[PDB]
Amino acid sequence: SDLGKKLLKAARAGQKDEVRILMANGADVNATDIWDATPLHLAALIGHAEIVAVLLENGADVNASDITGTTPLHLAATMGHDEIVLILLLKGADVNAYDLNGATPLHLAARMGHKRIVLVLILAGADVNAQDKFGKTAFDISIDNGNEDLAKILQ
Amino acid sequence: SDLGKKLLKAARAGQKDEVRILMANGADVNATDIWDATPLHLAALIGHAEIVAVLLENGADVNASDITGTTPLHLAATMGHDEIVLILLLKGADVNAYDLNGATPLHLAARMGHKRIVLVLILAGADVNAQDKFGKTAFDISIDNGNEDLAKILQ
Amino acid sequence: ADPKFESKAALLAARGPEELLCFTERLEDLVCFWEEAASAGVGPGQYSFSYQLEDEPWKLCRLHQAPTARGAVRFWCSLPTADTSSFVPLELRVTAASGAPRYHRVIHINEVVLLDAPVGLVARLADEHVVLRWLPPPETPMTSHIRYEVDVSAVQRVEILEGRTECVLSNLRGRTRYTFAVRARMAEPSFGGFWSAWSEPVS
Amino acid sequence: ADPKFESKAALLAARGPEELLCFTERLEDLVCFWEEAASAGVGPGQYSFSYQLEDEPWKLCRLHQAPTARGAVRFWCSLPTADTSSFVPLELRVTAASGAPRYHRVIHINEVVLLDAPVGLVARLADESGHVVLRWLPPPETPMTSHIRYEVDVSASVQRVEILEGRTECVLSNLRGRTRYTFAVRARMAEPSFGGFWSAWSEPVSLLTPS
Ligand code: NA
């Protein structure tokens, strides 16, 4: 709807107050764009933690996937948003959800060298052995980028 | 022994190479000082993550306690060492271990306002309700220091 | 204008490898790029760059394949001027021809400014010490809001308040020739970005 | 040095409350202190300060109870010069008489230096109209001036400019005109091995611009 589209725009812009207004007006917390990305997808990508908490409090799907299969945990893992990874994990996100490339948030975090996100995902219950469409594990990605500190953890 | 004291001294100074050398020379990875603090206690207090990983793989007690009852997870929590808290947790540290003051690492982290560590401890399985000798919970410490962001999580 | 973009692209590539990197030079343009290994069947027609700004429908941008000195393959897209509005969020998407994800980001045009290198750096010794003078980067607006930084090699790095285009180095180890270089950045209130490249060094 | 230590102790207490704070002045001394609420049965004999440096056995330092202006009780211990060696790690521990922990830290004498306030701050109207030239002297009885970083504060609100180490003068770019500005400078140790906290502000001076 008109309100549903404005909720996505407000979450992308990082407008905390506007999100609260649109929610009270009855906007769909899972309103999707052309790519099937919810407002939680954009708040996770932007790295706004207050809005992520608000959307989750109003019934947002923590495991929502878009056309590409990207869940909001993938976006928080890649961009390096440590708090939003933890918040989504406590809300009940699937650590082992994969996208169209078969990459779990452990893969995306390992590619970007986010050591703490990698450790948080393992603590949450990530599958270290799991491989993507190319057949590479999170350990195999660290070896290719020369991150010896990361590789020792994924053993 | 001769090597055991030099291992503690090397871990305090943050000398990664010397630790590996002394380990190969047969030093006790759990060599204790006058206060019963192991080299893993000192590497956690210094915030050296490379040395902590070395000691743990070489058979160091992750749940070692000193005279004060302080475990290395307590030290990493107070000093605000996000990486070492995660490493010790994956190595098998007791999230609900208390010192002589009855304070769990969730208490110490909340007192210093380390929001990110608090979420890590909750995910690992910390007891939010747990009280110290004074009878205060992790939530009760946040309200006294005016950290409203910290208090809302422990609600 | 493309040999400098070549140097600018290699500049950011060192800081954020495995990322999608965007930058603007005159606040009316935008150049986004990323670097990856060469694959047998993959070219610029195997990826799809799409952006969405304000409430205008998702638009497609043309990708260009170009090789780098380090052996990787650089794919870059230059957003048109009409779509570069400085102070609104801009959603970016790079999707593989199979439908699989590659990059997804939200940026602000004003927050990603990479200036040119300063020019005409002149070092003259007055007794105290050396006084350094230079010109602002060419074709760059709002000179009064440009912060600088000077590098000395023997190392020392001195910050220069925005607007000022000269400095005096107080204490030095001796009359030997030091190597100087200056780089520029965008200051405040809303603007920000990356350090530009170093100027032509002088001794 | 004891009326100054009081001001220095109150200075650091505002930045890092609820922890043990140490500082050195001439790199040959070390004074550690902390502040807590007054308890009926607690004095300096209910806590135990112990330090260990290099390979020397754990030594005991004498604590002194003193009240503060804010009502809290300050406990401080001054390590002897013979035990203050500048470039090695120093383990510190404060243990309660019951055996319970209080503080545990590892510090370096060189990394925790709190200098004196700069002196002789002079504000002069620059020949180029609109600018103000500030000149000052390094803190008194302080060696190695070339490794001292400064910072200047301008008051109408505030404006704060960083000053490269060694330099004892600056030129201020922007002025409002007929308003009176208040200037002050403070100093800390910069590089390479030395470090610490910002000193107190210098004696402020005021200047009036002519539009
Ligand atoms: Na913090």
XYZ file of C-alpha atoms and ligand atoms in Angstrom:
725
model
C 0.000 0.000 0.000
C 0.928 3.690 0.037
C 1.780 3.441 3.737
C 3.652 0.171 3.234
C 5.939 1.754 0.650
C 6.594 4.765 2.891
C 7.615 2.435 5.730
C 10.371 0.947 3.563
C 11.551 4.424 2.549
C 11.587 5.522 6.197
C 13.591 2.465 7.267
C 16.086 2.995 4.439
C 16.464 6.659 5.426
C 17.009 5.707 9.078
C 14.070 7.769 10.383
C 13.237 6.311 13.794
C 10.265 8.556 14.598
C 8.587 8.208 11.196
C 8.722 4.407 11.503
C 6.835 4.583 14.811
C 4.177 6.832 13.253
C 3.655 4.603 10.207
C 3.455 1.488 12.392
C 0.686 2.963 14.556
C -1.199 3.915 11.377
C -1.414 0.201 10.521
C 1.411 -0.249 8.013
C 2.456 -3.776 7.069
C 5.698 -4.466 8.937
C 6.522 -7.005 6.190
C 5.809 -4.747 3.208
C 7.998 -5.886 0.315
C 9.644 -3.904 -2.477
C 10.146 -5.143 -6.048
C 12.941 -7.368 -4.681
C 10.786 -8.731 -1.799
C 12.929 -6.950 0.809
C 11.075 -6.053 4.004
C 11.739 -2.906 6.066
C 13.819 -5.133 8.351
C 16.058 -5.878 5.354
C 16.814 -2.178 4.898
C 17.276 -1.343 8.583
C 19.774 -4.205 8.864
C 21.633 -3.051 5.747
C 21.661 0.563 6.958
C 22.785 -0.547 10.423
C 20.100 1.228 12.458
C 19.604 -0.805 15.628
C 16.709 1.181 17.120
C 14.546 0.680 14.020
C 15.448 -3.019 13.838
C 14.251 -3.405 17.430
C 11.034 -1.500 16.669
C 10.184 -3.528 13.554
C 10.889 -6.788 15.388
C 8.669 -5.635 18.262
C 5.781 -5.135 15.813
C 5.862 -8.634 14.318
C 8.487 -8.474 11.569
C 9.689 -11.746 10.047
C 13.287 -12.182 11.207
C 13.919 -14.905 8.588
C 12.342 -13.086 5.631
C 14.101 -13.737 2.320
C 14.145 -11.610 -0.818
C 14.389 -12.694 -4.467
C 18.115 -13.367 -4.007
C 17.493 -15.385 -0.837
C 19.239 -12.791 1.341
C 17.921 -12.720 4.906
C 18.408 -9.707 7.208
C 21.056 -11.696 9.081
C 23.116 -11.858 5.867
C 23.058 -8.073 5.492
C 24.012 -7.383 9.113
C 26.839 -9.925 8.816
C 28.368 -8.519 5.619
C 28.181 -4.811 6.505
C 29.737 -5.518 9.911
C 26.912 -4.518 12.274
C 27.787 -6.441 15.421
C 24.799 -5.321 17.499
C 22.201 -6.059 14.815
C 23.654 -9.548 14.334
C 23.172 -10.165 18.060
C 19.699 -8.583 18.113
C 18.488 -10.658 15.163
C 20.010 -13.755 16.770
C 18.124 -13.197 20.029
C 14.927 -12.604 18.036
C 15.374 -16.070 16.509
C 17.217 -15.750 13.204
C 18.433 -18.878 11.417
C 22.240 -18.896 11.479
C 22.217 -21.560 8.749
C 19.913 -19.828 6.264
C 21.523 -19.638 2.826
C 20.971 -17.397 -0.186
C 20.887 -18.352 -3.875
C 24.676 -18.818 -3.723
C 24.293 -21.230 -0.806
C 26.213 -18.868 1.479
C 25.267 -18.707 5.152
C 25.930 -15.530 7.182
C 29.114 -17.286 8.324
C 30.355 -17.207 4.716
C 29.600 -13.512 4.176
C 31.128 -12.521 7.522
C 34.264 -14.561 6.797
C 34.739 -12.889 3.400
C 34.650 -9.415 4.972
C 37.030 -10.352 7.803
C 34.555 -9.595 10.614
C 36.183 -11.770 13.271
C 33.741 -10.987 16.087
C 30.688 -11.549 13.883
C 32.236 -14.877 12.867
C 32.739 -15.803 16.527
C 29.194 -14.684 17.384
C 27.719 -16.805 14.590
C 29.654 -19.893 15.714
C 28.433 -19.347 19.279
C 24.867 -19.034 17.973
C 25.191 -22.403 16.220
C 26.588 -21.868 12.735
C 27.700 -24.858 10.663
C 31.407 -24.320 10.008
C 31.596 -27.203 7.514
C 28.684 -25.919 5.403
C 29.677 -25.101 1.823
C 28.199 -22.711 -0.735
C 27.252 -23.331 -4.377
C 30.961 -23.235 -5.273
C 31.745 -25.823 -2.586
C 33.868 -23.567 -0.366
C 33.467 -23.486 3.405
C 33.932 -20.476 5.659
C 37.389 -21.885 6.402
C 38.203 -22.065 2.683
C 37.299 -18.392 2.184
C 39.648 -17.228 4.950
C 42.605 -19.091 3.417
C 41.991 -17.375 0.070
C 42.080 -13.894 1.647
C 45.135 -14.534 3.829
C 43.325 -13.985 7.146
C 45.337 -16.358 9.321
C 43.596 -15.171 12.495
C 40.199 -16.023 10.995
C 41.352 -19.389 9.627
C 42.517 -20.662 13.027
C 39.033 -20.069 14.464
C 37.216 -22.012 11.730
C 39.289 -25.176 12.299
C 59.401 -23.913 37.901
C 61.940 -21.696 36.140
C 59.902 -21.745 32.920
C 56.521 -21.433 34.647
C 57.269 -18.015 36.126
C 58.741 -16.826 32.821
C 55.547 -17.906 31.035
C 53.369 -15.708 33.260
C 55.822 -12.825 32.869
C 55.783 -13.262 29.080
C 51.976 -13.384 28.897
C 51.657 -10.185 30.944
C 54.087 -8.406 28.603
C 52.096 -9.563 25.564
C 55.032 -11.387 23.951
C 53.459 -13.943 21.615
C 56.702 -15.510 20.371
C 58.150 -16.035 23.856
C 54.962 -17.810 24.967
C 55.271 -20.312 22.114
C 58.970 -20.836 22.882
C 58.340 -21.403 26.595
C 55.493 -23.787 25.738
C 57.832 -25.855 23.563
C 60.360 -25.872 26.419
C 57.763 -27.665 28.556
C 56.398 -24.857 30.717
C 53.154 -25.494 32.567
C 50.445 -23.615 30.671
C 48.586 -23.413 34.011
C 51.529 -22.047 36.018
C 50.146 -19.908 38.832
C 51.535 -16.778 40.483
C 51.195 -15.858 44.177
C 47.524 -15.035 43.555
C 46.797 -18.282 41.636
C 46.382 -16.392 38.339
C 47.331 -18.447 35.259
C 48.938 -17.037 32.090
C 45.474 -17.167 30.539
C 44.325 -14.848 33.334
C 47.001 -12.323 32.365
C 46.509 -12.545 28.595
C 42.792 -11.907 29.131
C 43.541 -8.948 31.416
C 45.985 -7.473 28.892
C 43.512 -8.036 26.065
C 45.922 -9.947 23.842
C 43.780 -12.258 21.720
C 46.605 -14.035 19.881
C 48.166 -15.276 23.135
C 44.812 -16.364 24.605
C 44.195 -18.561 21.555
C 47.680 -20.076 21.895
C 47.280 -20.860 25.599
C 43.826 -22.419 25.135
C 44.972 -24.793 22.403
C 47.973 -25.765 24.568
C 45.789 -27.078 27.395
C 45.072 -24.009 29.520
C 42.149 -24.131 31.947
C 39.479 -21.798 30.573
C 37.628 -21.941 33.922
C 40.684 -21.355 36.131
C 39.985 -19.282 39.245
C 42.426 -17.280 41.353
C 42.320 -16.455 45.078
C 39.627 -13.842 44.424
C 37.528 -16.326 42.447
C 38.059 -14.310 39.261
C 37.994 -16.379 36.082
C 39.531 -15.098 32.829
C 36.020 -14.467 31.489
C 35.541 -12.003 34.349
C 38.659 -10.080 33.307
C 37.749 -9.972 29.612
C 34.249 -8.785 30.543
C 35.341 -5.922 32.810
C 38.141 -4.595 30.591
C 35.797 -4.650 27.582
C 37.599 -7.234 25.445
C 34.926 -8.328 22.983
C 37.045 -10.834 21.054
C 38.446 -12.644 24.095
C 34.981 -13.027 25.641
C 33.859 -14.848 22.492
C 37.018 -16.980 22.322
C 36.793 -18.049 25.972
C 33.095 -18.848 25.550
C 33.751 -21.107 22.562
C 36.599 -22.782 24.466
C 34.082 -23.714 27.175
C 34.052 -20.993 29.820
C 31.328 -20.980 32.468
C 29.142 -17.953 31.744
C 27.559 -18.225 35.220
C 30.759 -18.470 37.283
C 30.953 -15.935 40.113
C 33.864 -14.499 42.079
C 34.145 -13.907 45.836
C 31.729 -10.976 45.459
C 29.174 -13.259 43.793
C 29.412 -11.287 40.540
C 29.006 -13.141 37.251
C 30.617 -11.821 34.041
C 27.184 -10.401 33.192
C 27.409 -8.209 36.303
C 30.913 -6.969 35.492
C 30.042 -6.198 31.861
C 26.872 -4.318 32.835
C 28.767 -2.249 35.421
C 31.233 -1.000 32.787
C 28.462 -0.287 30.268
C 29.746 -2.809 27.708
C 26.485 -3.281 25.818
C 27.928 -5.558 23.134
C 29.469 -7.990 25.644
C 26.177 -8.183 27.561
C 24.340 -9.400 24.456
C 27.072 -11.987 23.861
C 26.731 -13.299 27.420
C 22.931 -13.507 27.171
C 23.244 -15.463 23.920
C 25.752 -17.829 25.548
C 23.315 -18.532 28.387
C 23.919 -16.043 31.184
C 21.481 -15.886 34.093
C 20.025 -12.373 34.066
C 18.234 -12.945 37.390
C 21.424 -14.005 39.202
C 22.317 -11.772 42.149
C 25.629 -11.004 43.836
C 26.443 -10.774 47.550
C 24.705 -7.378 47.613
C 21.554 -8.909 46.113
C 21.650 -6.880 42.886
C 20.946 -8.342 39.453
C 22.578 -7.293 36.196
C 19.473 -5.177 35.574
C 19.806 -3.575 39.016
C 23.317 -2.358 38.196
C 22.200 -0.645 34.970
C 19.466 1.443 36.623
C 21.930 2.754 39.221
C 24.361 3.934 36.517
C 21.683 5.468 34.283
C 22.271 3.196 31.269
C 18.720 2.978 29.952
C 19.836 1.125 26.814
C 21.502 -1.497 29.021
C 18.495 -1.776 31.348
C 15.937 -2.389 28.589
C 17.824 -5.489 27.420
C 17.994 -6.977 30.930
C 14.245 -6.454 31.457
C 40.087 11.997 -16.389
C 40.189 8.192 -16.583
C 43.872 7.718 -15.648
C 42.996 9.633 -12.474
C 39.888 7.487 -11.943
C 42.209 4.517 -12.474
C 44.381 5.782 -9.611
C 41.275 6.628 -7.564
C 39.799 3.155 -8.075
C 43.068 1.476 -7.071
C 43.177 3.800 -4.050
C 39.889 2.640 -2.523
C 40.425 -0.984 -3.600
C 43.292 -1.306 -1.105
C 41.107 -0.192 1.814
C 37.961 -2.198 1.122
C 38.658 -5.345 -0.881
C 35.725 -7.673 -1.566
C 33.358 -4.683 -1.274
C 31.342 -2.517 -3.615
C 32.997 0.904 -3.527
C 31.442 4.183 -4.659
C 32.800 7.722 -4.680
C 31.988 11.139 -6.109
C 34.350 13.863 -7.309
C 32.184 16.911 -8.120
C 29.044 15.949 -6.089
C 27.121 15.619 -9.375
C 28.648 12.281 -10.426
C 28.917 8.823 -8.911
C 31.237 5.954 -9.828
C 30.724 2.548 -8.217
C 33.070 -0.376 -8.773
C 34.254 -3.709 -7.432
C 37.076 -6.120 -8.206
C 36.957 -9.892 -8.609
C 38.826 -12.750 -10.249
C 38.469 -13.405 -13.970
C 36.001 -16.153 -14.887
C 35.860 -17.848 -18.275
C 32.236 -17.126 -19.200
C 31.586 -13.967 -17.157
C 31.727 -10.400 -18.432
C 29.816 -7.172 -17.790
C 26.685 -8.760 -19.282
C 26.633 -11.383 -16.517
C 25.988 -8.843 -13.736
C 23.170 -6.321 -13.333
C 23.602 -2.987 -11.553
C 20.331 -1.500 -10.295
C 19.707 1.580 -8.157
C 16.643 3.241 -6.647
C 16.565 6.847 -5.466
C 13.739 8.885 -3.901
C 10.494 7.313 -5.237
C 11.693 6.877 -8.829
C 11.474 3.279 -10.122
C 14.507 1.017 -9.998
C 16.887 2.045 -12.773
C 19.602 -0.007 -14.453
C 23.199 1.130 -14.877
C 25.636 -0.023 -17.559
C 28.619 -2.027 -16.284
C 32.095 -1.821 -17.810
C 34.805 -4.478 -17.538
C 38.400 -3.247 -17.234
C 41.558 -5.007 -15.999
C 43.690 -3.833 -13.093
C 47.431 -3.889 -12.491
C 47.060 -6.514 -9.743
C 45.423 -8.973 -12.161
C 41.836 -8.691 -10.942
C 38.901 -7.613 -13.109
C 37.240 -4.308 -12.226
C 33.556 -3.757 -13.005
C 32.397 -0.145 -12.759
C 29.211 1.801 -13.463
C 28.790 5.585 -13.677
C 25.384 6.778 -12.505
C 23.917 9.616 -14.606
C 23.964 13.157 -13.257
C 20.160 13.465 -13.233
C 19.926 10.699 -10.616
C 22.685 12.025 -8.323
C 20.830 13.987 -5.654
C 23.234 14.623 -2.858
C 21.237 14.311 0.366
C 18.857 11.359 -0.103
C 19.610 7.639 0.426
C 20.491 5.676 -2.708
C 19.916 1.915 -2.779
C 22.340 -0.098 -4.914
C 22.123 -3.705 -6.079
C 24.426 -5.994 -8.062
C 22.706 -9.246 -9.054
C 24.303 -12.156 -10.881
C 22.822 -13.281 -14.197
C 21.622 -16.438 -12.410
C 19.579 -14.368 -9.940
C 22.051 -14.844 -7.071
C 23.151 -11.893 -4.908
C 26.495 -10.125 -5.134
C 26.305 -6.669 -3.540
C 23.592 -4.630 -1.833
C 24.169 -1.238 -0.233
C 22.613 2.090 0.730
C 24.820 5.177 0.399
C 24.543 8.956 0.507
C 26.137 10.924 -2.336
C 27.509 13.519 0.089
C 29.048 10.912 2.423
C 31.332 9.407 -0.258
C 33.520 12.190 -1.684
C 37.004 11.394 -3.025
C 38.810 14.563 -4.090
C 41.703 14.926 -6.500
C 45.275 15.239 -5.340
C 46.523 18.754 -4.507
C 48.864 20.366 -7.021
C 51.763 22.806 -7.015
C 53.367 21.802 -3.719
C 56.339 24.119 -3.110
C 58.790 23.773 -0.217
C 61.086 26.680 0.659
C 63.375 26.851 3.698
C 63.112 29.938 5.907
C 65.331 29.981 8.989
C 63.828 28.957 12.339
C 62.270 25.204 9.254
C 60.483 24.790 5.911
C 57.280 26.536 4.814
C 55.061 24.511 2.473
C 52.632 26.079 -0.002
C 50.252 24.366 -2.408
C 47.106 24.810 -4.539
C 43.719 23.116 -4.001
C 42.745 20.066 -6.083
C 41.663 21.085 -9.592
C 37.968 21.479 -10.422
C 36.875 21.045 -6.802
C 34.129 23.189 -5.224
C 34.001 24.799 -1.761
C 37.716 25.296 -1.196
C 37.039 26.872 2.217
C 35.640 23.486 3.360
C 38.605 21.303 2.310
C 40.855 19.801 4.985
C 44.474 18.951 4.196
C 47.241 16.747 5.582
C 50.990 16.921 4.924
C 53.449 14.008 5.067
C 57.168 14.256 5.876
C 59.592 11.432 5.068
C 63.058 10.896 6.540
C 57.977 10.190 9.263
C 55.635 12.988 10.343
C 52.044 13.827 9.399
C 50.557 17.225 10.263
C 46.895 18.194 10.032
C 45.948 21.483 8.367
C 42.821 23.411 9.303
C 40.283 23.593 6.489
C 40.797 26.537 4.160
C 44.478 27.035 4.940
C 46.796 26.065 2.067
C 50.161 26.607 3.766
C 52.007 25.506 6.894
C 55.283 25.961 8.770
C 57.117 22.950 10.207
C 58.597 23.929 13.570
C 61.338 21.464 14.591
C 63.346 19.224 12.242
C 66.381 16.972 12.676
C 68.624 18.840 10.233
C 69.112 20.747 6.993
C 68.858 17.571 4.905
C 66.124 17.434 2.288
C 62.864 15.930 3.546
C 60.247 14.493 1.200
C 56.865 16.211 1.486
C 53.434 15.300 0.151
C 49.948 16.640 0.838
C 46.487 15.106 0.490
C 43.041 16.633 0.875
C 39.683 15.586 2.293
C 36.193 17.055 2.481
C 35.245 18.569 5.800
C 31.859 19.165 7.420
C 28.780 19.660 8.250
C 27.017 16.998 6.135
C 29.881 16.169 3.773
C 32.429 13.419 4.284
C 34.411 10.770 2.506
C 37.928 9.490 1.910
C 41.446 10.882 1.820
C 42.547 11.820 -1.688
C 45.799 10.674 -3.257
C 49.117 12.241 -2.333
C 50.503 15.169 -4.298
C 53.641 15.019 -6.410
C 56.422 14.738 -3.804
C 59.052 17.432 -3.313
C 62.383 17.373 -1.504
C 52.717 18.757 44.564
C 50.170 17.654 47.172
C 47.705 20.524 46.628
C 48.278 19.822 42.923
C 47.800 16.065 43.365
C 44.426 16.827 44.966
C 43.430 18.870 41.911
C 44.936 16.173 39.682
C 43.049 13.466 41.585
C 39.749 15.337 41.253
C 40.568 15.898 37.569
C 40.912 12.223 36.625
C 38.047 11.145 38.906
C 35.566 12.876 36.587
C 36.773 10.971 33.511
C 37.111 7.462 34.921
C 34.857 6.915 37.928
C 34.385 3.461 39.526
C 37.956 2.358 38.597
C 41.469 2.701 39.983
C 43.375 5.586 38.372
C 47.154 6.050 38.369
C 49.347 8.855 37.067
C 52.948 10.063 37.090
C 54.262 13.636 36.935
C 58.053 13.431 36.492
C 58.273 9.768 35.326
C 60.030 8.833 38.590
C 56.889 8.698 40.777
C 53.580 6.874 40.610
C 50.386 7.641 42.536
C 47.332 5.385 42.246
C 43.958 6.240 43.734
C 40.245 5.483 43.715
C 37.105 6.946 45.269
C 34.215 5.155 46.962
C 31.399 5.795 49.414
C 32.107 6.030 53.133
C 31.433 2.806 55.035
C 31.169 2.543 58.806
C 33.904 -0.050 59.376
C 36.147 0.593 56.355
C 39.409 2.529 56.349
C 42.803 2.122 54.670
C 43.421 -0.985 56.807
C 40.507 -2.846 55.209
C 42.106 -2.794 51.738
C 45.486 -4.090 50.572
C 47.486 -2.470 47.774
C 50.025 -4.811 46.181
C 52.187 -4.319 43.093
C 54.652 -6.493 41.193
C 57.199 -5.136 38.737
C 59.854 -6.846 36.591
C 60.842 -10.070 38.437
C 60.812 -8.528 41.938
C 58.485 -10.165 44.500
C 55.027 -8.756 45.189
C 55.403 -5.643 47.362
C 52.935 -3.841 49.623
C 52.155 -0.125 49.311
C 50.656 1.968 52.089
C 47.161 3.350 51.511
C 45.966 6.732 52.783
C 42.333 7.655 53.436
C 41.297 11.194 52.512
C 37.913 12.837 51.863
C 37.068 14.661 48.645
C 35.088 17.795 47.859
C 32.259 15.705 46.372
C 31.827 13.810 49.661
C 33.436 10.517 48.625
C 36.461 8.914 50.300
C 39.705 8.791 48.299
C 42.292 6.051 48.871
C 45.730 6.681 47.371
C 49.141 4.996 47.387
C 52.453 6.455 46.181
C 54.890 3.858 44.856
C 58.548 4.475 45.792
C 60.961 5.743 43.160
C 63.103 2.591 43.288
C 60.120 0.502 42.114
C 58.940 2.898 39.358
C 60.807 1.717 36.252
C 59.414 3.447 33.211
C 59.222 0.879 30.396
C 58.228 -2.481 31.932
C 54.731 -3.756 32.764
C 53.538 -3.218 36.332
C 50.849 -5.474 37.788
C 48.567 -3.821 40.349
C 46.038 -5.442 42.665
C 43.712 -4.077 45.347
C 42.363 -6.825 47.608
C 39.753 -6.449 50.331
C 40.575 -7.552 53.871
C 38.055 -10.378 53.350
C 39.971 -11.690 50.325
C 37.453 -10.354 47.786
C 38.643 -8.554 44.634
C 38.479 -4.817 44.036
C 40.916 -3.841 41.273
C 43.421 -5.660 39.066
C 45.408 -3.888 36.369
C 48.632 -3.872 34.362
C 50.087 -0.456 33.520
C 53.248 1.104 32.112
C 54.778 4.122 33.867
C 55.522 5.806 30.536
C 52.013 5.313 29.130
C 50.304 7.089 32.056
C 51.756 10.617 32.309
C 49.690 13.566 33.569
C 51.562 16.821 32.933
C 51.170 20.208 34.587
C 49.161 23.045 33.084
C 50.919 25.350 30.590
C 51.907 28.811 31.791
C 52.304 32.285 30.326
C 49.378 32.243 27.904
C 49.399 35.472 25.872
C 46.680 36.487 23.400
C 47.636 39.075 20.782
C 45.609 40.567 17.936
C 47.196 39.417 14.686
C 48.312 41.983 12.133
C 46.035 40.362 9.555
C 42.621 41.490 10.781
C 40.254 38.786 11.992
C 42.976 36.506 13.390
C 44.250 36.052 16.947
C 47.724 34.765 17.829
C 48.085 32.695 21.000
C 51.498 32.109 22.568
C 52.393 30.115 25.667
C 55.188 28.314 27.541
C 55.466 24.572 28.253
C 54.530 23.318 31.739
C 57.189 24.288 34.287
C 59.933 21.839 35.255
C 59.012 19.355 32.522
C 61.670 17.732 30.295
C 61.506 16.811 26.589
C 59.287 19.620 25.347
C 59.478 18.312 21.760
C 57.145 15.425 22.725
C 54.361 17.516 24.315
C 51.065 17.904 22.450
C 48.761 20.851 23.130
C 45.111 21.774 22.588
C 43.486 25.218 22.668
C 39.941 26.058 23.777
C 38.009 29.145 22.658
C 34.974 30.358 24.620
C 32.311 32.834 23.518
C 30.022 28.074 23.509
C 33.354 26.396 22.659
C 35.872 25.849 19.870
C 38.850 23.498 20.220
C 41.954 23.305 18.010
C 44.654 20.628 18.170
C 48.295 21.756 18.191
C 51.201 19.726 16.822
C 53.731 18.559 19.399
C 56.551 21.007 20.061
C 54.791 24.088 18.731
C 53.930 26.668 21.404
C 51.920 29.093 19.255
C 48.916 29.068 16.944
C 46.886 31.389 14.721
C 43.098 31.371 15.079
C 41.166 31.539 11.812
C 37.645 32.749 12.631
C 36.397 35.434 15.012
C 32.913 36.857 15.519
C 33.977 40.487 15.879
C 33.088 42.703 18.805
C 32.682 39.718 21.148
C 35.239 38.972 23.880
C 36.887 35.555 23.469
C 38.369 33.476 26.310
C 41.361 31.281 25.431
C 43.001 28.404 27.302
C 45.543 25.703 26.433
C 46.302 22.291 27.963
C 49.105 19.816 27.298
C 49.648 16.055 27.206
C 52.409 13.687 26.133
C 52.066 12.518 22.522
C 54.578 10.078 20.975
C 56.384 7.687 20.570
C 56.339 5.612 23.776
C 55.044 8.238 26.219
C 51.355 8.897 26.802
C 48.691 9.715 29.341
C 45.926 12.221 30.084
C 45.170 15.844 29.300
C 46.529 18.246 31.907
C 44.501 21.034 33.477
C 43.689 24.197 31.559
C 46.038 27.166 31.631
C 45.139 30.489 33.202
C 42.521 31.890 30.794
C 43.002 35.159 28.935
C 40.480 37.367 27.146
C 40.757 39.423 23.959
C 38.370 41.748 22.115
C 38.162 41.951 18.317
C 37.379 45.146 16.360
C 34.892 44.021 13.662
Na 31.109 0.289 25.519
